[PDB]
A paper describes a structure:
The HIV-1 Env is a trimer of gp120-gp41 heterodimers that are heavily shielded from the host immune systems by N-linked glycosylation and further protected from neutralization by conformational masking and considerable sequence variability. A glycosylated region near the base of the third variable loop (V3) of HIV-1 Env forms a supersite of vulnerability that is targeted by antibodies originating from diverse germline genes in multiple HIV-1 infected individuals. Here, we determine structures of antibodies in complex with HIV-1 Envelope for all observed members and ancestral states of the broadly neutralizing HIV-1 V3-glycan targeting DH270 antibody clonal B cell lineage. Here we used cryo-EM to visualize the interactions of a complete inferred DH270 clonal tree with the co-evolving virus Env.
The I3 intermediate splits into the I2 intermediate and the mature DH270.1 antibody, both of which acquire mutations that are primarily focused on the LCDR3 region. The I2 intermediate and DH270.1 both acquire several LCDR3 modifying mutations like those observed in DH270.3. In DH270.1 several mutations occurred at the LCDR3 base that were distal to the epitope, and together, they likely stabilized the LCDR3 region. Additionally, an HCDR3 Y106S mutation occurs in DH270.1 that resulted in two effects. First, the loss of a hydrogen bond between the side chain of Y106 with the main chain of W101 and, second, the release of the interaction of the Y106 side chain with the N332 glycan; together these may act to modulate the interaction of glycan N332 with HCDR3 by allowing it to engage the W101 side chain more effectively. Where DH270.1 acquired stabilizing LCDR3 mutations, I2, which developed considerable neutralization breadth, modified the LCDR3 conformation, stabilizing a N301-glycan base contact point. Seen from the perspective of the entire DH270 clone, failure to acquire an optimal solution limits further affinity maturation as was the case for clonal members DH270.1 and DH270.3.
Author numbering:
A (entry chain F): 134 to 139, 150 to 185, 185A, 185B, 186 to 193
B (entry chain A): 32 to 139, 150 to 185, 185A, 185B, 186 to 309, 312 to 321, 321C, 322 to 354, ...
C (entry chain K): 194 to 244
D (entry chain B), E (entry chain L): 512 to 547, 569 to 664
Write the structure that this text describes.
Amino acid sequence: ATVKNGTVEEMKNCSFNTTTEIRDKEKKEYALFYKPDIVPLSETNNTSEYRL
Amino acid sequence: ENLWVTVYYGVPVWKEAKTTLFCASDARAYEKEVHNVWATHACVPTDPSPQELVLGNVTENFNMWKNDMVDQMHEDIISLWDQSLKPCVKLTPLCVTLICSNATVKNGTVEEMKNCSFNTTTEIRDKEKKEYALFYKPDIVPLSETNNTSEYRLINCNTSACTQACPKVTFEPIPIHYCAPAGYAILKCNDETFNGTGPCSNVSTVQCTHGIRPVVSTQLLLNGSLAEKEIVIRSENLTNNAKIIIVHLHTPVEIVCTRPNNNTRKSVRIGPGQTFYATGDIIGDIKQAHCNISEEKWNDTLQKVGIELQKHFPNKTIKYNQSAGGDMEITTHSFNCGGEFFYCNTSNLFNGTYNGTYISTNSSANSTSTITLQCRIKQIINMWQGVGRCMYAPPIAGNITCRSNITGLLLTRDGGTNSNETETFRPAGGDMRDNWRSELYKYKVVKIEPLGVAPTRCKRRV
Amino acid sequence: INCNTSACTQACPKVTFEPIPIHYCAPAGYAILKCNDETFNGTGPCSNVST
Amino acid sequence: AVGIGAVFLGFLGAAGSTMGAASMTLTVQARNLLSGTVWGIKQLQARVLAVERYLRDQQLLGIWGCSGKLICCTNVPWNSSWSNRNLSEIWDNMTWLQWDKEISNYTQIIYGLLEESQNQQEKNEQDLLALD
Amino acid sequence: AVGIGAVFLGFLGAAGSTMGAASMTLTVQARNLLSGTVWGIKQLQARVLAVERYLRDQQLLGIWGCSGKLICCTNVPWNSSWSNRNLSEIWDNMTWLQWDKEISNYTQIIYGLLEESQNQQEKNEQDLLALD
Ligand SMILES: *[C@@H]1O[C@H](CO)[C@@H](O[C@@H]2O[C@H](CO)[C@@H](O[C@@H]3O[C@H](CO)[C@@H](O)[C@H](O)[C@@H]3O)[C@H](O)[C@H]2NC(C)=O)[C@H](O)[C@H]1NC(C)=O
Ligand SMILES: *[C@@H]1O[C@H](CO)[C@@H](O[C@@H]2O[C@H](CO)[C@@H](O[C@@H]3O[C@H](CO)[C@@H](O)[C@H](O)[C@@H]3O)[C@H](O)[C@H]2NC(C)=O)[C@H](O)[C@H]1NC(C)=O
Ligand SMILES: *[C@@H]1O[C@H](CO)[C@@H](O[C@@H]2O[C@H](CO)[C@@H](O)[C@H](O)[C@H]2NC(C)=O)[C@H](O)[C@H]1NC(C)=O
């Protein structure tokens, strides 16, 4: 998303496939995470895959 | 004449007090395994010696509904059932899309069991194999609002994770004796007509309480103590009908229940090294589960109960009626039998009236006459709230029988209307405190104060 | 050779299998009697008893 | 009657009986301050609570000068304001279980009286036995 | 010999020695009733069990009138049917460890006798000290 100022932080919007309460029938779900609690997954050029 | 303060020790003085109690089993509770029955585990072998003692000149207040002993009984059984279900397999791979078939009985008098199939994580994990098992219909729900009538889910997986009951632990109630610790005593009210709240003019004392059957039952009180002389009723405030009434029977009513279906077991692997037992076949013809009560006894018994109920409602005659209505576990009489859990529709029993007019039992024209309750079976159980509630009781092979004695009723009046001459009573099961309180009413815990001061004609020697 | 009979667990690397010597001590009110005879066979009256 | 022979009154046999009958055969109550074995943590706690209680009673009794576990005549004179009642009023038909309802109010006074009155006794023997 | 000087016999030194030798220096056995610290629940259980036993012995010795922890002469007359044996037969070459095999049968009689006898004793002082 877009803030462009740097004085305020935003929260990163992340989405994920969830093992729901009936196990083997997934559904995608999203939540906001503070940036210190999220890290990129790999050294690869993909700037859109993250890990806690 | 002069007197001096003289101090005595070993005085027979006490005050009522709060404290923990031991639990003690009968002598034959230790040939079994660990945790089976719980009487082997939480309790000590009891010594019947010394026996009861009667105190010759003392009177004391006994208050059944304020007794903390049942309040500790509740915590004891809760923690003791919670303990047992720790090592047992906590299911969880069974929260999957179960695909089930229609079956065919076409009558409605008998149920079938739904045949459901599911993909299983084998004991080598990631190499699945489809497997099927029979499930009682109350334990299965459709998965979604969609039009697919062939995809089902267990009643678990929405509210809580659930655990199988181990096969090496049994549900049968071994009698439990509550014993007092040092410095305390238990007072037994020997008055055989005591109502529940008032001064007992004949007070005994015993080393330990007599055996209690921790039998869980909702509407009726199965195997337990019988009234000494007559039917006695107990309630805090009969004017406000919301309070439960305990009826205590002198003459028992015999009840027998059966499951004629010859079920056969099946085994399924759930991850590495652990098994989930299930029903795989029904040998023979499918038939209805039921309980049989003799009409010749029930008809006598309920008017015998009517004369006792007349006394605190003398203005009005009596009629009996169906429960208040609600969910299965709320409305139906329920009990355990050999490991299975039954739920009986009890509308046939609570029917009829009494107007101070006794009807004869002699001659009993038909002792083979019966009234048949119809009962349903479940395997997914919510036995207490907050005890780690869900438990899956595995099926038991063969056919089973449930003979026992009825010894009391739990009831609740309906609201009055029209100032009617014939107001009515309903059954009311509920909190299991009311079940144990029906049998712990004889006892109270006290604390011995052996130190006392008195005036006397003797002084110190210098 | 797991997965058929039972689930299995790794032994931690910060715990060792080496037997450290163990001394069994008596509680208060009890005593341990040592048969001081140097040829005792295993069942019978020890004619020299220490504590 | 108190002429029992070999005692068989049981634990609380004299409850409701006379003060004199309960005053003889006091040991049947004193000896029984013990019971139990252990499951978990709670029953062991119940075990140690009894020892706490027994040692409380023994210490309080001993500070008054009562090593004996049955009866003591004490130096403290009687304050008659507590009942102003006769010997037969208190002794001949009452029981200890009904006596405790009356003077339990004044136990917290008598305890301090006894506690100090032992010190007005034993300090003097500390002087006389030096004079001897 | 029992002329030890400063005592060094240890815990159970007089085991197998004469009744007289074991009768002197009884404290070396009595004093050794304290030990332990805790791992888990079973060790604290073992700790409290020792206190239970110690208070058993101390109480039962107390109701007999024996506040002293070594020896007592008691008012119970001797019943000679228990052994009908001489003083040298019992005292001069036996030890306590083999004396316990004989009269352990009759301990449960002597205990009740002593228990009642202390009550015949101390009730009289409750009267005599009032007559004084
Ligand atoms: C964070 O990201 C999530 C997606 O991962 C955002 O949720 C999405 O929000 C949009 C806009 O409201 C939803 O689209 C709309 O859906 C309705 C469905 O009725 C449709 O009629 C509209 O035309 C429109 O397409 C979208 O459904 C929703 N995603 C999910 C899975 O529900 C969320 O808004 C983001 N939040 C922030 C603060 O960036
Ligand atoms: C509940 O449903 C299951 C299926 O989910 C039923 O099991 C199936 O029963 C049939 C009839 O016995 C089996 O078919 C037969 O298999 C033998 C194999 O030798 C073959 O020779 C026959 O020609 C016939 O096809 C079928 O294999 C079996 N399914 C599995 C997976 O074993 C079960 O009978 C149903 N039970 C009830 C009470 O409805
Ligand atoms: C399984 O069913 C059989 C047949 O109904 C039961 O056998 C009867 O049991 C009763 C006791 O309740 C006896 O009085 C009968 O003589 C038995 N035989 C018949 C033909 O009725 C059997 O008890 C049931 N199994 C269990 C465990 O109760």
